[PDB]
Design a protein around this ligand. Structure first.
Ligand SMILES: [Mg+2]
Ligand SMILES: [Mg+2]
Lengths: 243, 244
């Protein structure tokens, strides 16, 4: 019997915006000893998972899915690296990024720095303040955006400009939003595991419709566990270990 | 008895164009240190680029490592200086600058654009019309395109027209980008950290002509300048100094 346990990271394996607690490391160690395969699926880049989970994340987890699985590792080896260009084509990319640049130039937010548009493997990250800002400026913009809805207004303008582009808009991050082809949500990673496991369990804190765990949670191929915190994840994994 | 410093540009000085340090250059720098020279690098790009070009042991290879023109400075792998653009320009000017850059990038008609157009570094802003997130092929294609269509040079003209009072220098240093930084924060900036510690300072670089990102340091009166065309000429010129 082969059972895969897939975890969202922020809010599932960690307190919000902090690092993996000892209780989480303990339960993952104990799940692997029982013979569970374990994997992470985040919407961020790998560097962000190293920051939340630690430098040895490739040893802790059998599977590390970065960018929703568009960048995939098994036992620290790259098994997949998607590219957006083959899905959208150059003309649509260039029109999209030119409209995003114009919209970011029209903002009246108090702080802007750099790295507004990050072209990753199979997604574009749009960050209104720019990813090159300080921690203090990042935390400030998070609060600003709850009052002024900067990301939500930009998404609405991009939806209005590009109705038939085949893009999903996902406010995943603290100060940014993700743009990727329809179907390249976190359920994307299931193409690498669907044929290799009897059961796949998914654990995540953002499993409501609109949350970046909804598609993987509701995929017919997985057993979903909605968790409110890492304490719920530990309780749920402990139940599965019992068997 | 004299203290001598040898300062090297990196791309086209320590490396073949756009490629990494050859073992031969590694050898000549070792031989210069053995002969009693202090050696340093002065790059216009970030530190991570220098590590790609020179290797993970760059801080052991060179006594001084000057990245972003010396706005980020290391001596024996210890940070001695990190400049901050915000204290020079203030937030209002940075925000107006980057919004005008974004507008201008949005109005381009170039065939390929991807991402990381505007990089806010320690003491400079890097503007890349195609975006730093493009492939090697796309980067090499844009270098040729820009030689014909002068995209960077026309963006610089628009930014200069928009911001006559901002006290900025515009430097076409890279393969696909240009740098923007306060006047006086060119590669000559690094000389403040060394000018009082050396009897003689030599500079080797390939872009020592007016409009080149090595021009101001090459022509500084504190400098003995050595215009080189390739890393082969750098080996030759350092060999001459070792031989006396
Ligand atoms: Mg989460
Ligand atoms: Mg050069």
């Amino acid at each position: 019997k082969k059972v895969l346990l897939l975890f969202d990271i922020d809010g599932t394996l960690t307190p919000p915006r902090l690092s993996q607690p000892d209780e989480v490391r303990e339960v993952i160690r104990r799940a692997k000893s029982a013979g569970f395969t374990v994997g992470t699926v985040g919407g961020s880049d790998l560097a962000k998972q190293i920051e939340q989970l630690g430098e040895d994340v490739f040893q802790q987890f059998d599977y590390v899915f970065a960018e929703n699985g568009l960048l995939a590792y098994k036992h620290g080896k790259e098994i997949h690296r998607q590219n957006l260009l083959k899905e959208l084509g150059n003309e649509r990319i260039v029109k999209f990024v030119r409209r995003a640049l114009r919209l970011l130039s029209e903002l009246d937010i108090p702080v802007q720095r750099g790295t507004f548009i990050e072209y990753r493997n199979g997604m574009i990250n749009v960050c209104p303040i720019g990813r090159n800002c300080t921690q203090s400026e990042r935390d400030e913009f998070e609060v600003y955006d709850k009052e002024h809805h900067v990301r939500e207004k930009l998404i609405k303008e991009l939806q209005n400009s590009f109705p038939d582009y085949g893009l999903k808009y996902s406010i995943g991050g603290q100060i940014s939003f993700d743009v990727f082809p329809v179907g390249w949500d976190k359920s994307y990673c299931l193409r690498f595991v669907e044929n290799d496991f009897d059961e796949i369990h998914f654990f995540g804190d953002k499993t409501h419709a609109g949350g970046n765990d909804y598609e993987i949670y509701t995929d017919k191929r997985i057993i979903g566990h909605a968790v409110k915190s890492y304490k719920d994840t530990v309780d749920e994994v402990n139940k599965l270990i019992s068997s």
